[PDB]
Structure 1
């Protein structure tokens, strides 16, 4: 069947979205199916279910492709990171670009961990995003747990749950990989190369698989605290950010104590 802004609203209410919720969404918009007014009907329906006080987020990142790090003669030609002009990454899909390009949207300043938010608390999730360790508490992810937010996997593969990288920052497990890279950002309004360091989110900890987030999400849904539903034609899940992070921290700490 075709999905409308009214139809998508009922599908989002059924899966467990309410007024005032702040939900981080990673979406594979192709699985949703035919929509009348395009994929904007999804975002418009969400802002109707959660209201103007609710907030919708999306993992923006940016198109850099690691050709900046050690391809000199590119350095003077790589544009600086601008949280107003830098396009979001196309790895997980068009959904982060849909939020950012929507009028009235905002975008945090940490290049690797940048989130595109829109809604009443969009000014709060994007503000004061730490550059180094951009997945820690001083990030939109940590504020999503602090605000008891939700996460909706709109047909996207479950291993793409970026929120669980915030659990990697908190989990006490031995030998985390410290990733030090150099990226160009805007310092005093001009392009300046800053040295960054964070926990390796491009590769899992030594031992686990690249998609070990998928097993953590499937284990959490087995508890019943999560909800599974369909939005249009895309089978989706909806989990609380505060519980699945604490569930993943215990998952990682339990796995790390085997030393």
Structure 2
């Protein structure tokens, strides 16, 4: 059994292509990393040493309210509003977003379903002004990731969990984009108010594609020799440029709607 250390994981990260000042959104399957001396906090600590105090690490937090509780009117009274300071991350995204969110100094954005946890030099910029309606468009941490030419790291995670590609769905012009409208409780200056949202669908694909077609795009982007693979600990990992994968994915999407 190979043990990882904050020093060891730092080197694996520089090996994958991570440098000073980088902003990186990390999706992670942490137990694929193997044994770590000081726990998965060594991952975040190693990252921050590599990228420096001006860099920023992000995690997709979201939140925990199931759709049927939300859509069931007996439950409505007892559902706490979304609190970017106390609402815990959705557990389907793994411990990684909660690891970030619960580290002191971290910040979290306002759009509940698209909410992002961030820590580092630009965590305030990344979490600020998160558009509530259409939280995966230009006024979101994902959009600012592209503007800052950040990166996406799949830390042993399945490739179809690349949330950044939902931003490509928003930008990409193709016909019959499913529009989603739901109502969720948030706080308005301290008090629970129920509110109507609208966004492009992120729970299921455009009609033709499969539930995991994100993975095909990522593998097809890695096929052009952009990006870079490598081992972080013992987890197979991928590091992609945010702007390039998003430009790649929107054409791929716009190319597919022109068809049939």
Give the TM interval when normalised to the shorter protein: over 0.9
Which consecutive aligned stretches of 4+ in structure 1 deviate over 4 angstroms post-superposition?
A: none
Unaligned 5+ runs, structure 1: none
1:53 touches 1:119 (CA, 8 Å); kept in 2? yes
Structure 2 SS opposite 1:96: helix
Give yes or no for contact 1:20–1:50 (8 Å, CA) kept in 2. Answer: yes
Quick check: 1:2–1:36 contact (8 Å CA) kept in 2? Answer: yes
How far apart are residue 70 of structure 1 and its match?
1.8
Q: Which whole-Å deviations, capped at 9, do the CAs of 1:34-86 have from their partners, x for residues lacking one? A: 00000000000000000000000000000112133321111110000000000
2:61–2:93: 8 Å Cα contact kept in structure 1?
no
For residues 66 and 80 of structure 2, the distance between their equivalents in structure 1, rounded to whole angstroms, comes to 13
Does the residue aligned with 1:218 lie in a helix, a strand or coil?
helix
CA deviations over 1:144-181 (Å, ceiling 9, x no partner): 00000000000000000000000000001000000000
Q: Deviations over 1:201-222 (max 9, x none)?
A: 0000011000000000000000
Unaligned stretches of 5+ residues in structure 2: none
**Matched residue of 1:159: which SS?**
helix
Q: CA deviation at 1:187?
A: 1.0
User: Matched residue of 1:91: which SS?
Assistant: helix
Instruction: Give the alignment's TM-score, normalised by structure 2.
Output: 0.99
Kindly report which structure 2 residues correspond to 1:178-193, keeping only aligned pairs within 5 A, or say none: 178-193=179-194
- Check the 8 A contact 2:101/2:107 in 1, yes or no: yes
Q: Secondary structure at the match of 2:58?
A: strand
* Residue 240 (structure 1) shift: 0.1
How far apart, in 2, do the equivalents of 1:199 and 1:28 lie? 26
Counterpart residue number, 2:3: 2
Per-residue deviation, 1:188? 2.2
Deviation string 1:77-121 (CA, Å, 9 cap, x unpaired) is 000000000000111210000000000000000001000000000
Partner of 1:76: 77
CA contact 1:68–1:183 (8 Å) conserved in 2: no
Inter-partner Cα distance in structure 1 for 2:227 and 2:189 = 44
